[PDB]
Amino acid sequence: GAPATVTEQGEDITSKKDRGVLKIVKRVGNGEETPMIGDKVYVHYKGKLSNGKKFDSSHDRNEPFVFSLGKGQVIKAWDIGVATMKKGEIAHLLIKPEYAYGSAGSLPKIPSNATLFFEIELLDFKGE
Ligand SMILES: COc1cc2cc(c1OC)O[C@@H](C)CCn1cc(nn1)CCCOC(=O)[C@@H]1CCCCN1C(=O)[C@H]2C1CCCCC1
């Protein structure tokens, strides 16, 4: 499925080229602009453990998930991945534990050394 396709054909967007954050663009956005550190960003997302044992959607809240980019308000893989996205874009990310919750995890919700998958839609971003 989606996670396996990202393993096989996904772009490595880490600085370290360690395959810790892999990306496929599923729908292209608009304009050239991508968000800067500090920008307020608005997204819809669906997320799961790679084996599918916990599943979370912003659609379950009916409302966008909102955060300031690059302030570590989310896991490092989102700061990395969303910074690459254009307004309107939908992308898949597959993420190793080092760019998510690591060997400590976040129990009971996230186990130790968990790989994560997300589908992300970038709705908008606005300057500080
Ligand atoms: C580790 O705890 C959680 C992880 C995730 C979601 C969590 C959560 O409980 C705080 O709550 C959901 C269920 C309620 C909405 N929400 C998101 C956040 N705070 N509240 C932000 C929490 C930080 O989350 C993240 O950095 C990432 C990226 C942003 C969206 C949510 N993220 C998650 O890791 C989910 C997680 C995805 C994998 C399946 C299980 C949930």
Between CA 43 and CA 93 the distance in angstroms is 14
> Are 89 and 28 in contact, with CB atoms under 8 Å apart?
yes
Alpha carbon of 92 to ligand 1 centroid (Å): 16
35: DSSP letter: P
Between CA 65 and CA 102 the distance in angstroms is 23
> Are 2 and 92 in contact, with CB atoms under 8 Å apart?
yes
Burial class (CB in 10 A: 0-12, 13-18, 19+), 61: exposed
Between CA 43 and CA 78 the distance in angstroms is 11
Known catalytic residues?
45, 55-56, 75, 101, 118
- 43: three-class secondary structure by DSSP: strand
Atom 3 (ligand 1): residue with closest C-alpha? 109
- Amino acid in the structure at residue 60: D
The structure was resolved to a resolution in Å of 2.1
